[PDB]
Design a protein around this ligand. Structure first.
Ligand SMILES: Nc1ncnc2c1ncn2[C@@H]1O[C@H](COP(=O)(O)OP(=O)(O)OP(O)(O)=S)[C@@H](O)[C@H]1O
Ligand SMILES: Nc1ncnc2c1ncn2[C@@H]1O[C@H](COP(=O)(O)OP(=O)(O)OP(O)(O)=S)[C@@H](O)[C@H]1O
Lengths: 318, 318
């Protein structure tokens, strides 16, 4: 389940290979082709890197970095956003220029699943099965090798390509950066509690909920709170005042039953899978190991799904 | 202990009075006098407001805000940074212009305690007694009326004035803002876990530790980790390879004994007070109510301390 198949191992070595061959990244070596999407602190562009001729994704975060910490922050960006997993998007490098931090990444040609959701209307179960595996494995990797974080996965944080790969975005860079800046000084210090430095406030559990929710979102084709009543259901699915504001949604999430998949239209194991994710008490909610052996995942792992053909057809790639 | 004495009540009404009299805040109505200090996302200036003739502190956060969310963010800034407590710095208003969010505040003429620490060398116990009360009361207020947050108090977040008032800064605006931007969408949504929306991951306990540490810092006159060995002590206090890097400090904090006050030179009750704050297990660490009745605080509350005279003399005000 967990270690890499040699095709995976090769694809990774092959990226790392290229990365060292790219040389030093600077702004006037990039030619902007199009906008891929909007990040929290800025915009992700598809760009060609003039020297190597490589196509990349370049996330531009408009953010002022004091000279005294200018690198050291960056040192840590490199350290924090360079991964070596099939389930995390490839990292080329990161640089600063004129109040812009640039993060250069592997270009995923299929885009994010929020865009793909719009193209498709709904993403089918078997497809989400393979998405789940990927997210679970990515989050596993991030947790073993990188972080103590709230990682709350949205469809906009999941990337796909025409090779049929599914990878997490390198998401939440802006929050990370401001936090980094908040925790650096002259001389080295920290006012963070011991409790917070082994960072188990941030158990995997919160990540799982968000994933659960993303899965229902993608499966039914809309943000799932407030749930859709029976009117909507039969219509969406063939017989299986409104816009609440934010204070209300937040209380709804805390105080109301968790959203869930409609019956009949989705397999029992999928329904159970997401129910495990959305158990409201995080003591009782599934953890990542639990999900990796859940019925849905076992079945999905064995299914031969033509992910890449589904995707290309959905978004019109070729 | 908790509700306001009529001099306090008056000072508050009096600020709120003025605030409504200031009218609308914009950039070209401000004349920059000097820099008060550096914030995480920018700089805090002392400024005169041309129309009212009021002196203010204006925090400039260099940060791009998409038009689609431009207000709504701000709506929430107003809501989040306007308090009505003697122990939180007064809020005039907040506005945006040209990639700058401005936060206008009551000017505290004594500056922050990090600057005052530099002027004084060390801050004496009785003085820190009154500082403690203020911090405890401020954090109490923030918790009852405002927030679910990590609020980790540093000396740079504590403000004093020549009236002898002690108030928390309106600190952590940059982190708050990026978080706000991270959690807003088109349509209203949230991928935050229920657990995180009643925000008790963030118990008062982490705030307390940081305060504890700030108190020792101020009392001995340096960031207290690594502790100073007996060499330093006798010298600082009259007989009561080095710079560790950040990975090490962080492990030191998790794995080593908590720092503490030197004996003899500080009262037992002060020593105990900070020891309660720095208990490494947050289950056993003091909470805010506990501290409000601790021996140190009881004694400090009754002491008549000429705070304002100490301060003016230390920083040379008049
Ligand atoms: N490597 C990539 N290839 C293709 N599209 C990408 C890539 N990385 C990001 N995107 C697109 O850009 C959007 C935002 O990227 P994310 O990494 O999800 O950023 P964010 O977490 O929203 O904001 P940050 O990192 O805090 S500035 C995604 O939803 C995708 O549409
Ligand atoms: N109202 C004020 N009066 C006088 N000095 C102030 C005032 N507010 C802030 N300062 C000074 O500016 C410094 C930074 O302000 P803080 O509110 O502590 O900001 P920060 O939390 O470091 O950064 P932010 O809010 O995330 S941009 C303080 O250490 C003080 O020196």
């Amino acid at each position: 389940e967990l270690e890499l198949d040699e095709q995976q191992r090769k694809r990774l070595e092959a990226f790392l290979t290229q990365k060292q061959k790219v040389g030093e990244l600077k702004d006037d070596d990039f030619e902007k082709i199009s906008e891929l999407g909007a990040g929290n602190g800025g915009v992700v562009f598809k760009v060609s890197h003039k020297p190597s001729g490589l196509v990349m994704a370049r996330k531009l975060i408009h953010l002022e970095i004091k000279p005294a910490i200018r690198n050291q922050i960056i040192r840590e960006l490199q350290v924090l956003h360079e991964c070596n997993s099939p389930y995390i998007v490839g990292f080329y490098g990161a640089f600063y220029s004129d109040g812009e931090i640039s993060i250069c990444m592997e270009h995923m040609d299929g885009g994010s699943l929020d865009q793909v959701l719009k193209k498709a209307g709904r993403i089918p179960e078997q497809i989400l099965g393979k998405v789940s595996i990927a997210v679970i494995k990515g989050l596993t990797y991030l947790r073993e090798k990188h972080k103590i974080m709230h990682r709350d996965v949205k469809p906009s944080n999941i990337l796909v390509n025409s090779r049929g790969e599914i990878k997490l975005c390198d998401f939440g860079v802006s929050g990370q950066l401001i936090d980094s800046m908040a925790n650096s000084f002259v001389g080295t210090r920290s006012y963070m509690s011991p409790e917070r430095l082994q960072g188990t406030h941030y158990s995997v559990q919160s990540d799982i909920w968000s994933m659960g929710l993303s899965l229902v979102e993608m499966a039914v084709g809309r943000y799932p709170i407030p749930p859709p009543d029976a009117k909507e259901l039969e219509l969406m699915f063939g017989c299986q005042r409104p816009p609440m504001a934010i204070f209300e949604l937040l209380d709804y999430i805390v105080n109301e039953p968790p959203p869930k998949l409609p019956s009949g239209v989705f397999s029992l194991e999928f329904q159970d899978f997401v129910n495990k994710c959305l158990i409201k008490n995080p003591a009782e909610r599934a953890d990542l190991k639990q999900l990796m052996v859940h019925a849905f995942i076992k079945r999905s792992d064995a299914e031969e799904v033509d992910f890449a053909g589904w995707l290309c057809s959905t978004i019109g790639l070729n």
